[PDB]
């Protein structure tokens, strides 16, 4: 059975090698059982300083979600995170404006619509548009890294063309695709 929860199923890995790029961080997520999990909200994560992997800078960058944290993880010099679920969309089309240190893939149905294949310090992305066919739960995933240094994590997505934009948070997530009343 699964945990049905207002939020993403999140996972956090950390290693001692270079993540350069997305296909590294998700080799690194098939190669070995999550260093943690936890439930992913609240998603807009940091920012803080000198290396998401060390001490209790995942705590911090994870805030509201980091007491379901299932481990303090050990300290890795690089480390990310891996979130896998559902958001309620209504049919229409929709973009996200995601700001990140270091990079990122977001997939909804299967199909990438946020890319960032390389590390950057901070930076903010206004996404092209994508649709969404049918009113209800998509599944939704997302990768996010830091090689070190600084890090944050805010995608944020809109459904009016640009002019306003939202975290996603358990207004619209579910862990399962069923609808969560917690
Ligand atoms: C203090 C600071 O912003 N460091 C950033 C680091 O987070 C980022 O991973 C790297 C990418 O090459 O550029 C920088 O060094
Ligand atoms: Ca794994
Ligand atoms: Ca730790
Ligand atoms: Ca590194
Ligand atoms: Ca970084």
Do not use: C
């Not at 807009?44 to 911090?60: F, I, N, P």
């Not at 050990?74 to 480390?79: A, P």
Request: no cysteine.
């Amino acid at each position: 059975p699964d945990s049905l929860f207002a939020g993403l199923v999140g996972e956090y890995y950390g290693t001692n090698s270079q993540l350069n790029n997305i296909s590294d961080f998700r080799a690194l997520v098939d190669s070995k059982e999550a260093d943690a999990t936890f439930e992913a909200a609240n998603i807009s994560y940091g920012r803080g300083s000198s290396d998401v992997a060390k001490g209790t800078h995942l705590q911090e960058f994870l805030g509201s979600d980091a007491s379901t944290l299932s481990t303090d993880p050990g300290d890795n010099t690089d480390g990310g995170i891996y979130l896998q679920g559902y958001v309620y969309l209504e049919a229409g089309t929709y973009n996200f404006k995601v700001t990140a240190d270091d990079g990122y893939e977001i997939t909804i149905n299967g199909n990438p619509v946020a890319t960032v294949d390389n590390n950057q310090s901070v930076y903010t992305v206004t996404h092209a548009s994508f649709t969404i066919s049918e009113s209800g739960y998509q599944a939704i995933d997302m990768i996010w890294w830091d090689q070190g240094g600084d890090y944050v994590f805010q995608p944020t997505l809109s459904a009016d063309g640009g002019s306003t934009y939202f975290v996603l948070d358990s207004a619209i997530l579910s862990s399962t695709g069923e609808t969560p009343y917690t």
